Structure formats: C-alpha cells, structure tokens
C-alpha cells in the first residue's frame, strides 16, 4: 500500500492509503474462505471450483463488506509505523475500489502541533492558606442560626439584618411601573434579596415613622431600563421582626449527625468537614488561577476536531440542563461554545506537553489517597467505594482530577506560587 503524509490543513494530514490488488484480493478472500467454514459449506466444497471464480464473481457482494476492514486495520497499522499520532477522528475519502486497480482512500485526520511553552516561570499563581479558625467556627454557627432563625415580631429598633414590615408607594423614574407599590410589605434586610440603599432608608429609623426615599437601582440589575434609575417611595414604617435564633438542644444538634450535645463536637465537626471540602476547593482555586495565567501567558492552535468534541459535550450538557433535548443541541449557535471549548483544549495541549515532558500520570496512590479521604468521611466507606468504582461517570472524575492536580502542580513547581495566610471567610468572599 502506497501511503502519503499530505500535510494540507497543517494539523490536517492526509495519509492516502493506496491498497493495491495484492492486498485487496487476499484480504477479501480471507473472509470468503472463512464464510465457507462459518456455514460449514467447506466440508461439501471439494475445491474443484478455484477460489478466484467465487472471489471476484460470487464474492463481488462480499467485497463491499471487506471495505471497512481494509480502511480500519490498514490505517491504524500505517500511522503507527509512520510515527503519526491522530487527534479527534479520521475522515476516509474513498477514491475508488476496483478489481485489478488500487483501492485508494485519502484518510484526512488532524494531529497534535508543536506545543509552544513560554514564561511558565513568569506565571504568578496565588496560594490562599485558608483554614477554619475559631473566628470562622463561631461565624459559621452564628450564620447557620441566623439563616434558620424564626421571625419574631418586635418593636423599638431596626437592626441592619432584620425583617421590617412597611407600606411603600411611588413611581420608578417618576413613571408608572409595577413593584413601586406594596402594602404590608416585608423586607429581610442585610440579605441579598432587595436593593442595598432601599433597606438603608429604613435602617436609619426605629419602628413606626413615615418618610420618602430616593433609591438608585444598581447596574447589577439585569432589568435593562431600570439599571441605574432613581425611584421615589413613600416608606410607611410599620414594625420590625427580629431573626430570633433557634435552639441547639440535644434532639436538635443530634438530628444533623452530631450525636453529642457538647457544642465543641459541632465545632470539631465544622473543622474536620469544612477542611475536607476546603483542600479540594483550594486545589481547584490555585488550579483555576494557574490555568488562567498559563493560557494567558501561552498560545497554541488546536485541531478543529478536538474543538468540535468539546463544543459537542457542551451542547449535550446544555440541552440536558435546558429541558432534556436529545441531539437538538447540534443546531445550537457554535460561537457560544467555540471560544471556551477551544480554550479548554488549549489548556489540554499546554498541560498535555508539561505532562509529557515531566512524564505525569493518574497516580494510583493519589487516586486511592483521595478515595480513603472521601469514603471514610461518610457513614459507610464500603458501599461508597463499591458504588464509586462502578459509577464510571464519577470514577472518571477521580482519574481526571488526580491527573489535572499533578499536571497543574508540575506547572506550579515552575511558576511563582505567591502564598498568603488567611481565614475560611476568604473562600466565601468569591462573588465576582
């Protein structure tokens, strides 16, 4: 077979495999002699009729069945000895198939380029040394009690995070709009629920006065013609309602799993659990910043096939979360996925090369290390590990994270890891 290496699309190389009649008529005949044995007709076939008659004439139908066998096995054989590693998927352009003439087929497939790595030492990646200090423990428990607090109607004073009842009436931008009028209205202030500034109109007051404030709607508001407007509302201040914190009695605290009534056990619980989640969160934190700076400091063209693959995974995931559409997503606007997908494969090529050079792997002791730290933190490790190894969707995720961690940390060994000391609040103060 005459094979080429026609580097047409740069990434796209064309190995035009020209299988001559010597390999055609033998490989077709390999199946034909097996058909006789498979149906046991070979026992009845005396061999009087030479195979050539039943190969070209009677086997003419079967020559079609051998086309895929020729295209598949002779391709994978060729590219290995030609030292050409493919990427994505190969496109077979079958020139012609005839007896006597050559089965010529131009297999156009994309390959990996020379992955340009630069400034990998110049990349400054932040390392937040986050932990659950006593400030974070008390803060955590207090927040839990405030979020699960029972609303107790009081009088006298508005606190910054209370639930205040008013009657407000007016117009937005001096024009009739809905939402600028609500009788017996109630506001859990200090909470991301209403305009910061609307609540502050009330917060500069006590119980049962009457006034009028101008609220400037934020540029954070997705409401296109409201964002940055000034509305005039006559706030009839009625009552206040305290977020009265619930109990922490034996039957309450055990219901969450903390079998001991001692609060120090729930403090210990917050420490061991939130750090179990935290190490994974800090790994993904330093990871995402490293990847951001890696690609921001580096450039590499991706094979279109790989971009198509990532886009397609995003289309399936999109349609699934949009309603549950089966393959309709193939029509979704490619440019919505194009940039981010290609960018994620740029990550895969840059990490691909630093991995290759530093001979990295899905480290068995790392996978298993994280499997023990995972499973032991639950009720029953046994069935979680059994379920895990069989849940290929998640067992994949375990290989992928281990490899991605080691991949990034090989770049961190090269990169300027700017380490800082900070509390568990750090991880939570990530809005935008």
């Amino acid at each position: 077979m005459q094979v080429s290496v026609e580097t047409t699309q740069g990434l796209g190389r064309r190995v035009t495999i020209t299988i001559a009649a010597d390999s055609i008529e033998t490989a077709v005949k390999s199946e034909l002699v097996n058909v006789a044995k498979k149906v046991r007709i070979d026992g009845f076939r005396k061999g009087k009729v030479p195979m050539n008659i039943v190969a070209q004439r009677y086997g003419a139908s079967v020559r079609q069945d051998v086309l895929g066998d020729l295209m598949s096995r002779n391709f994978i054989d060729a590219i290995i000895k030609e030292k050409i590693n493919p990427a994505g998927a190969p496109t077979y352009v079958p020139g012609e198939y005839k007896l006597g003439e050559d089965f010529t087929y131009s297999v156009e497939f994309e390959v990996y380029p020379e992955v340009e790595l630069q400034g990998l030492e110049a990349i400054e990646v932040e390392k937040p040394i986050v932990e659950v200090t006593d400030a974070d423990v008390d803060g955590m428990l207090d927040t839990l009690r405030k979020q699960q607090a029972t609303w107790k109607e009081k009088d006298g004073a508005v606190e910054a995070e209370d639930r205040v009842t008013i009657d407000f009436t007016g117009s937005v931008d001096g024009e009739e709009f809905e939402g600028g009028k609500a009788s017996d209205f109630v506001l859990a202030m200090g909470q991301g629920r209403m305009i910061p500034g609307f609540e502050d109109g009330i917060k500069g007051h006590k119980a049962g006065e009457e006034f009028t404030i101008d609220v400037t709607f934020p540029e954070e508001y997705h409401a296109e013609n409201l964002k940055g407007k000034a509305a005039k509302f006559a706030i009839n201040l009625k009552k206040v309602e305290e977020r009265e914190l619930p109990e922490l009695t034996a039957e309450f605290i055990k219901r969450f799993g903390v079998e001991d009534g001692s609060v120090e056990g729930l403090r210990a619980e917050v420490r061991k659990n939130m750090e179990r989640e935290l190490k994974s969160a800090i790994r993904n934190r330093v990871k995402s910043q490293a990847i951001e700076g890696l690609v921001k400091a580096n450039d590499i063209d991706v094979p279109a096939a790989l971009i198509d693959s990532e886009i397609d995974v995003l289309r399936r995931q999109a349609a699934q979360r949009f309603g549950g559409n089966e393959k309709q997503a193939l029509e979704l606007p490619r440019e919505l996925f194009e940039e981010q997908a290609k960018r994620r494969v740029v990550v895969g090529l840059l990490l691909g090369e630093v991995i290759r050079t530093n001979e990295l792997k899905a480290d068995e002791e790392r996978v298993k290390g994280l499997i023990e730290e995972m499973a032991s933190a639950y009720e029953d490790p046994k069935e979680v590990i059994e379920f895990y190894s069989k849940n290929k969707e998640l067992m994949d995720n375990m290989r992928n994270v281990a490899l991605e961690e080691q991949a990034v940390e090989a770049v961190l060994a090269k990169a300027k890891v700017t380490e800082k000391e900070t509390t568990f609040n750090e991880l939570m103060n990530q809005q935008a």
Binding site: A188, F256, E269, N273, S280, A281, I355, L360, M374, E379
Partner: protein
C-alpha cells in the same frame, strides 16, 4: 414544520420586581417547613453503620465538596490518552 414564530414581546420594562424575596414568614408557611417534625431518633444514630464520621450530611452547598458523592467539575483531560489503562471505548 414550516416556521412557528412564538415571541410574546419580552416585557423587560419592570423586570426583577424582587419584593424583598420575603412574604412567607407569617405563621402559615413555617408550619409547612415543620410538617414532619419526628425523624430518625435511636439511642445513637442507627448502629448498623461502619463509622459515624459523618452519618448525616449536615454540610450544604459551601463552595466545593458539599458531601453528596459527585463534587469537583473543572477538568481538562484527554492530553494524549495517558489515563489509567482501564477504559471502555464509548464515545
């Protein structure tokens, strides 16, 4: 199909009314939250478990981890198919 046009304007005039995200905590709705009350007593927390490290997942949607067996998400993968040699060819 020809081309069914269903576009009912948009009505982005006064969007995100908000209403302070609150008008439920008024006696009636907290009964629906408290509807059940008694669940999982025991002397301990059901002693048929290997360990009580965290038998009941009290931890919610706090950044990453969460407790439910899934977590994580951001990956890259592929590279050059260097992955642990135990893979089903399933596209």
């Amino acid at each position: 199909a020809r081309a069914d046009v269903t576009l009912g304007g948009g009505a982005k005039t006064f969007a995100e009314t908000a209403t302070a995200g609150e008008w439920q905590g008024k006696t009636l709705r907290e009964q629906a939250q408290a509807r059940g009350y008694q669940l999982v007593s025991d002397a301990a927390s059901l002693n048929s478990v290997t360990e009580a490290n965290q038998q009941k997942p009290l931890l919610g949607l706090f950044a990453d981890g969460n407790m439910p067996v899934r977590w994580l998400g951001p990956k890259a993968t592929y590279h050059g198919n260097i992955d642990k040699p135990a893979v089903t060819c399933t596209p």
